[PDB]
């Protein structure tokens, strides 16, 4: 017999191998469509979550009840010091998918970047990238990187730029940088390459990638919550106070005919630590780190022109539960996925 009294399902399936994520720096899954006409830019970056705050903006939505009123918007602040480009990488299109030719990273490399290779390192001899580098100065420094780029010019189509974060600058206890390919959505390969050629080894800050008031999408991993019963996980009903064996459950899993519990019935399971792509968040402010020309500029952070104090976004006693944001943040409308200190793509 039918359900007497209809209702929506509890919690979407288009979402549902609700497992502990296999990765942790939010992997970008789709890089925007490179229209070959507009200039070369990077399409992504890699900040990290600090904390949050009361922003007060004047509004300009003619028609609304709040035309020209003050409102407070809750905002995150994403600590985003500049990212170094180490290596470039070329993808060719195929019937079978999108295979990768030729990864080439720089002479030099870094040391934080090294970290994101050999698991336990104080044990290691730190040998990574020691015979690669040797190529950035000889006769075979002209073969396998020159004939190579010529190759990546010829047959290749889509070019990303491997870039490692500067972990050192942060208050995190972490020293292990966050490498990621960031696609270049430029105009034409070669132009989209004699450029990455040039930005090897080189600082890349947030004001290249991003503009203040661009809608962006944040890609990161949900804040962890352990095993949860069905009522916390799938957010179901509770059964009444009477029930002999547990009231934080689902009564009926299935009909004693499709003789399997289904796909799509509510269950106990890992909640949180899930990968998630949140979209279309606004940038309220692109920041600037407190740098020196004489004696600090803490001012150049939270000092809007309509108040002109000398604040840093750092509240009194840090962003509780990591620390002080000492370089370029981006201030994002509302809340973003993930806990504090979290790598946020």
């Amino acid at each position: 017999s039918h359900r007497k009294f209809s209702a929506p399902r509890h919690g979407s399936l288009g979402f549902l191998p609700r497992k502990r994520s296999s990765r942790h720096r939010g992997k970008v899954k789709s890089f925007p469509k490179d229209d070959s006409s507009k200039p070369v830019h990077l399409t992504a970056f890699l900040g990290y979550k600090a904390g949050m705050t009361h922003i007060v903006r004047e509004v300009d939505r003619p028609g609304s009840k709040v035309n020209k009123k003050e409102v407070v918007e809750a905002v995150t602040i994403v600590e985003t010091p500049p990212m170094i480009v180490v290596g470039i990488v070329g993808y060719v299109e195929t019937p079978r998918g999108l295979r990768t030719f030729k990864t080439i990273f720089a002479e030099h490399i870094s040391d934080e970047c090294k970290r994101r290779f050999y698991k336990n390192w104080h044990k290691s001899k730190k040998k990574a990238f020691t015979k690669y580098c040797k190529k950035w100065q000889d006769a075979a420094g002209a073969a396998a990187l020159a004939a190579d780029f010529s190759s990546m010019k010829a047959y290749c189509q889509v070019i990303r730029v491997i870039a490692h974060t500067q972990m050192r600058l942060l208050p995190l206890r972490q020293k292990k940088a966050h490498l990621m390919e960031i696609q270049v959505n430029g105009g034409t390969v070669a132009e989209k390459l004699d450029w990455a050629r040039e930005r090897l080894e080189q600082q890349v800050p947030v004001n290249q990638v991003f503009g203040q008031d661009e809608m962006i999408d944040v890609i990161g991993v949900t804040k962890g919550k352990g095993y949860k019963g069905v009522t916390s996980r799938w957010h179901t009903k509770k059964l009444p106070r009477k029930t002999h064996r547990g009231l934080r459950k689902v009564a009926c899993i299935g009909a004693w005919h499709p003789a399997r519990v289904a796909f799509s019935v509510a269950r106990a399971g890992q909640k949180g630590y899930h990968h998630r792509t949140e979209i279309n968040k606004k940038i309220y402010k692109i920041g600037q780190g407190y740098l020196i020309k004489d004696g600090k500029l803490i001012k150049n952070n939270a000092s809007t022109d309509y108040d002109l104090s000398d604040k840093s976004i750092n509240p009194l006693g840090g962003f509780v539960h990591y620390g002080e944001v000492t370089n370029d943040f981006v201030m994002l409308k509302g809340c973003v996925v993930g806990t504090k200190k979290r790598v946020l793509t």
Partner: protein, 201 residues
């Protein structure tokens, strides 16, 4: 015959071909069907789309990741149809399928090999000219390929290339024929003995 087979899927009939492939796979002969986008089907476009979409609804309710795999690439689609004509539960049937091999477009090694055509699965022969149809390419697209565009642009790139070879090969034959005439009185009593027992007339 012996050795590896290469069949050029274009202009064939999806299952009519696959029955012939599958017979020879079971006789130990290695077949390689190529260019499966080109493979075509009797009945009008939509008919077989509608018939495919019927497939896609067939799906193991209690978990679908177990349930039937409705592969979308024509290679894969055809494989399926060949496979249904093998006894693939058993060891000889899986050992059979391994002798098959199937591509969308026409790849390395197989660009570079001459390649054959089953007239008894060939559309112009098997069908009437006043009847309608799908290309498994377009069918495959509207069902969830991602790679009709790519395997187009690559095949156009291959065609342009292959044309060069065809033209250079064309130019060697013109040399052969001119060099027969430029030496036809010290091979004029060998060519004799050719044309006498049939060869070369």
């Amino acid at each position: 015959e012996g050795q590896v087979l290469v069949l050029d899927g274009r202009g064939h009939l999806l299952g009519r071909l696959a029955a012939i492939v599958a017979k020879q796979v079971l006789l130990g002969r290695k077949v390689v069907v190529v260019r499966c986008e080109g493979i075509n089907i009797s009945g009008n476009f939509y008919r077989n789309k509608l018939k495919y979409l019927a497939f896609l609804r067939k799906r193991m309710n209690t978990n679908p990741s177990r349930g039937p795999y409705h592969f979308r690439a024509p290679s894969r689609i055809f494989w399926r149809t060949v496979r249904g004509m093998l006894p693939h539960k058993t060891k000889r049937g899986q050992a059979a399928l391994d002798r098959l091999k199937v591509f969308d477009g026409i790849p390395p090694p197989y660009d570079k090999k001459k390649r054959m055509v089953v007239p008894a699965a060939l559309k112009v022969v098997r069908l009437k000219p006043t009847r309608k149809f799908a290309y498994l390419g377009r069918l495959a697209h509207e069902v969830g390929w991602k790679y009709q565009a790519v395997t187009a642009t690559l095949e156009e790139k291959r065609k342009e290339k292959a044309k060069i070879h065809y033209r250079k090969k064309k130019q060697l034959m013109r040399l052969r024929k001119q060099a027969e005439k430029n030496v036809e009185k010290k091979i004029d009593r060998f060519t004799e003995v050719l044309k006498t027992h049939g060869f070369l007339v």
